[PDB]
Design a protein around this ligand. Structure first.
Ligand SMILES: O=C(NCC1(O)CCC(F)(F)CC1)c1cc(=O)c2cc(F)ccc2o1
Ligand SMILES: O=C(NCC1(O)CCC(F)(F)CC1)c1cc(=O)c2cc(F)ccc2o1
Ligand SMILES: N[C@@H](CCCC[NH3+])C(=O)O
Ligand SMILES: N[C@@H](CCCC[NH3+])C(=O)O
Lengths: 501, 496
């Protein structure tokens, strides 16, 4: 790339020649979309010589047809406009025609002034009098993502993706639309949006390993939040009744097609709801959003590339329920031992994992073993949206005991195409039990479970002030957008995803 | 505490007796606000014995008037409702009347079922048949209620309507702000809070580590360098509202995480951004207050009240000229010369201004502005045209040598906004980044390392662009009339 070097030299040339060098302000008359709305339907060959307008965008094409005529395409805000620059119309106060145009390259951000209309062949055009180089491009660009060095370039240099690929631009617009729809749903129910800390003295609220940091003046270690749950529940103690939060969680684990170290989640807590109420809301909210985007409840998905097969995901309600333990037992052809957290059941579940070639967790806690078994036997049955329900207490330290089922909790997870989208429960509000499950979590952490959380006394003290019967819920926004926008890699739906070295 | 131990014992006794112990679901008939709207203007003494309703809230008052009659107030969703519990209405299949009510204490979350109406004295009431303890309070509550309010925010919310108001106002303000930019065609985005290289402001970062990637990371101090990459990418009008993390001081206007809004607008300059700032903020003030002139208590609610006037046009102060007016003498040129650095140290010594460390031209300029210029900004006031040497991402001023197209907005001497015509020329940008890396190497912990990924993005052509940041928490402080940032953040950082 002599190209980059030579462009730096061209620019120092222009600068030293007293020619326009990175002008501070270019005043457009209207956006390119506005220009196409206003003039896109004029007759072929129409020109309005009584109207002078200024436009700007990035140059996608330059073709000099003759010594007297240059055609540009400029692109901005999803619209292309042709610029026809005829030597006879050039404003010599800006420089000589050939000098002015010799400064421009494909990729440059440029301004033009001229008369509006359409060429004889029917192309929406600006018949220019002047051209201004606003911000040059110092690299030779490809014309499509196909011409990049790797397809990793799309994620390491997202601005290239965005310049070249309409599909990538549509994803981020759909993401905003979906989030707006969600905020509207809850705002109409009378919820209050809140923000709770992302720096925590004690991390909690999920099965996740945290990022650790330190505040120098406070002389204290802090964790990045894994989830907002413990703070949100304190707002229900506080009487706020209906709260939600949409923001980042930080989880220090692996990166793959469905995991980024920071990701966006929504949580809500609703006083007087139970998990049955929450299943119903989940179904209403998500089917409404699918409808809003797709116009029916049966939507396409390409689980391999858009070069692979298309399947259909059916969101018609109500959705299938699978009971966690029973579905495991059906996959095994035999019962788990009771109690589920006894050493007898631990041993059995290790034996089952070996028998079914399921990779063992570390450490081999009852909860982690159950999770591996569910992963293999239950989550794999979840093609259409399906609730896995009634998780064991031993894996659910903040979920309230099941009103009917010994050793289980009033919990669900939503899975779509084998991927977890939501997690929700009737909230545990009984402090003695809450403390005991926190102690069991602390014991698991001490034994090497990097996903187990420490005891949070601040939270136990809050429960002692009385948490009303409450239902809470979380949704992974990024994974939702993967299904709505038909993407199979979370890197498609996050602007600047985490990338290896 | 005996009260807490005893309450645990009571709850075990209840459990062992087979009486209601943390019921899973209580189905209300309607909310307390709906109940008050439906029945609140009935005739005194009215009762409808044909309608049975279930209501719930937190008990704020218990008055056992007689052996036969107990009065409660419950509170839920900002509405109080009286419950009148008469032994002659009690459903004995829930327990004997004295047993059922003996389980209840001030602070408990409870449900009642009964008949709707109004007492003779004209109190909106439920005439109850039953009571269900849903979630007991194990602590004796104060009747009304700073350290506890921030460490146990649920107590503040439970007892103090003024705290609930602040958080509702916060949400309303941020909705207003979203609406403003959405109507202009902006796209809301999210950029990384975990950064290989921190940048986009002058701040000490938080440091962390990603174990699988085996890499140290920084928490973002600002989203700016990623957001500008989106303008290179063609997204034209982007905003982000989210947390920044700065490993610095904690005081009345600083919390280690805070909410900032940034936006980037292709084709704008800083003049456009001042006009937008005026329009946005004066319009929000008017929406909330009904006037452009609003109260503020700078020393808290025990002190004096002043008036902040948001009427436009807002005052502009030029950075260097206002320092020079304060000094009664000119700074030396160039502003980043050792001569000027040494002169600014003399001026700090003379005017009793605490010296920065290290004694860089930028830090000394900042100290002088803080003393002479920020202190003149009562009403919203733009400090404009900051020197380049303190503004490494701001584009050179089109007229004024050594300066940039930058502003800060100050209100009551506190920074609310920072904005500029963006530097889009990569040779100068690299030079200024080198100067920052040199500053860091000499001891400036607020200087950022060079980010080659950003320099490469600038080489692809950043359109002329204007960018801007607003401190949301400090805005709420003004709009809500609080002089401590801990009042506008639900769970502010507290000393250990
Ligand atoms: O969306 C995700 N999961 C679904 C939830 O568990 C998310 C939280 C909840 F919203 F509260 C309930 C549903 C998800 C996305 C990630 O990129 C990710 C990265 C990790 F390092 C660890 C877990 C991750 O999980
Ligand atoms: O609102 C604040 N400052 C105003 C701004 O600089 C904020 C960023 C901007 F919005 F982009 C432009 C305006 C503010 C609030 C804090 O709690 C805080 C804490 C610290 F540790 C360090 C700086 C802090 O700054
Ligand atoms: N904190 C949960 C989501 C809410 C669960 C119900 N309280 C998670 O991160 O999975
Ligand atoms: N990143 C700046 C605000 C935006 C300035 C204009 N690009 C700050 O943290 O102060």
């Amino acid at each position: 790339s002599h190209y980059t070097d030579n462009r730096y030299k061209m620019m120092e040339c222009i600068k030293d020649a007293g020619r326009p060098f990175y002008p501070h302000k270019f005043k457009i008359s209207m956006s390119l979309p506005a220009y196409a709305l206003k003039y896109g339907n004029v007759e072929n060959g129409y020109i309005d010589k009584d109207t002078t307008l200024s436009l700007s965008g990035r140059v996608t094409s330059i073709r000099s047809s003759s010594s007297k005529l240059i055609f540009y395409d400029i692109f901005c805000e999803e619209q292309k406009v042709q610029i026809i620059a005829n030597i006879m119309e050039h404003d010599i106060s800006t420089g000589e025609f050939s000098v002015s145009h010799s400064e421009i390259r494909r990729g440059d951000v440029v301004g033009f002034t001229g008369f509006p209309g359409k060429s004889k062949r029917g192309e929406l055009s600006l018949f220019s009098k002047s051209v201004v180089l606003l911000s040059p491009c110092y690299h030779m660009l490809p014309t499509a993502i196909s011409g990049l060095k790797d397809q990793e370039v799309r994620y390491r240099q997202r601005y290239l993706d965005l310049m070249l690929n309409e599909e990538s631009r549509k994803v981020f617009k759909l993401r905003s639309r979906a989030i707006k729809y969600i905020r509207n749903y809850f705002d109409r129910l009378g919820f209050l949006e809140v923000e709770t800390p992302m720096l925590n003295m004690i991390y909690g609220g999920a099965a996740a390993r945290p990022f650790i940091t330190y505040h120098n003046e406070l002389e204290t270690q802090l964790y990045m939040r894994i989830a907002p749950e413990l703070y949100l529940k304190q707002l229900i103690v506080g009487g706020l009744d209906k709260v939600y939060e949409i923001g980042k969680n930080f989880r220090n684990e692996g990166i793959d097609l469905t995991h980024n170290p920071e990701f966006t989640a929504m949580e809500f807590y609703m006083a007087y709801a139970d998990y049955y109420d929450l299943m119903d809301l989940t179904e209403e909210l998500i089917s409404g959003l699918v409808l809003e985007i797709h116009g029916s409840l049966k939507i396409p998905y390409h689980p391999d590339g858009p070069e692979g097969k298309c399947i259909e995901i059916d969101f018609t309600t109500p959705w299938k329920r699978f009971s966690f333990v029973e579905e495991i037992e059906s996959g095994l052809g035999e019962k788990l031992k009771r109690p589920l957290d006894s050493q007898e059941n631990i041993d059995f579940m290790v034996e089952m994992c070996e028998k079914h070639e399921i990779e063992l967790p570390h450490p081999r806690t009852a909860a982690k073993l159950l999770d591996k078994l569910a992963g293999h036997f239950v989550e794999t049955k979840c093609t259409n949206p399906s609730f896995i329900i009634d998780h064991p207490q031993t894996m659910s330290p903040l979920a309230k005991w099941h009103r009917e089922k010994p050793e289980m909790t009033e919990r669900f997870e939503l899975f779509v195409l084998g991927k977890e989208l939501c997690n929700a429960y009737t909230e545990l509000n009984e402090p003695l039990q809450q403390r005991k499950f926190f102690e069991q979590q602390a014991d698991a952490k001490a034994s090497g479970d990097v996903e187990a959380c420490p005891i949070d006394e601040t939270f136990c003290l809050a429960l002692e002030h009385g948490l009303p019967p409450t239902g809470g819920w979380g949704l992974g926004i990024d994974r939702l957008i993967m299904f709505l926008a038909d993407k199979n890699n979370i890197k498609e739906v996050i602007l600047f995803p985490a990338m290896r070295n």
